Amino acid sequence: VTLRRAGGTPLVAAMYHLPAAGSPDFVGLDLAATILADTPSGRLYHALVPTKLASGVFGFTMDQLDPGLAMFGAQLQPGMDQDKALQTLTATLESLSSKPFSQEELERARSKWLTAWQQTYADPEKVGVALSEAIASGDWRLFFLQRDRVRDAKLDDVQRAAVAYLVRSNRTEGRYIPTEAPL
Amino acid sequence: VTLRRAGGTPLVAAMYHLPAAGSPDFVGLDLAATILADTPSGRLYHALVPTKLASGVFGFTMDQLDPGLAMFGAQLQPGMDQDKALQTLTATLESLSSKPFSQEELERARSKWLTAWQQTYADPEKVGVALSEAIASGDWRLFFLQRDRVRDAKLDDVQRAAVAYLVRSNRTEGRYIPTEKPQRAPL
């Protein structure tokens, strides 16, 4: 691999199906995702980047899909080992029971979520859109209820939810490997 | 403030449930409460008294109750508003992750505890009473065991325990509001 034509970026991803937004588990997962995907101080980043398995990581939950999905992913430089990054990515995600969330991690997560919420609520374009989604989704309250749930979420509940949801049986894998004179 | 009949002022409180006295976490919370409610040095005071937010501050743990509770309170001045005081009190209790305890704080709190233990131990009426309670609780050793745990506690343990239990999920809120005497002419 002395010569490489300049090209695309290989991708690796793991996706997990979420419970309904109105269900009790959802907020915990959304926080767990938050803890997991933080750059640069997150668990995924440490597992993959300094380690040199990926250039960068991402993660988020996607409530507006039907049904809902949580996605975690990596972008890699060409020639980095795609299988290893995927296995590492999934292992970090599905091993929380061995390495449980700290309160410190959770409070930082909760604080960031609430900050974003307050930002939406304070923004006239945004709140209106958020309420429409809650209404279209069948419960107008749910924009408000999630905030309440985020404040009251116990670490044990977040941990239990992550462990139950971020599991192989709930896992869908995404991969992209970019195709490839006188040289 | 402009006019009030003479009487008591409101007090605001926050209570958090505690682990079992037999748990090692318990001691960490006991010491954390002692750090937190230190007046006037202590954090609660600083947050509330000179902000003229509160007249006075208290905090302690109660292991005789089944189960245990930690209580923190603020005695308000007239016209101080309850909601603010309660909010700042709870917010300061529930934010230790943002501000860690210090070795200095732990050793001072540990010494107060040990002194209190010693006073009880020395005094024959009291020690018997303490041993009785330990026995009722189902472990005779507890009086002695708690002291050793206090001696053995590490700052991270205390810091970790405080942060785990001092949480809104665990919060109960109390307001003692004195009933206002009826207004009288000509005032």
From TrEMBL, chain B:
Naturally occurring in which organism (per UniProt): Bordetella parapertussis (strain 12822 / ATCC BAA-587 / NCTC 13253)
List the GO biological process terms: proteolysis
The Peptidase M16 C-terminal domain extends over 1-111
Full protein name: Zinc protease
Q: Which family does it belong to?
A: Belongs to the peptidase M16 family.
User: MF terms per GO, please?
Assistant: metal ion binding; metalloendopeptidase activity
Q: What are the alphabetically sorted keywords of the record?
A: Hydrolase, Protease, Signal
Specify whether Hydrolase is a keyword of the entry.
yes
Task: Specify the taxonomic lineage.
Answer: Bacteria, Pseudomonadati, Pseudomonadota, Betaproteobacteria, Burkholderiales
Q: Is Zinc found in the keyword set? A: no
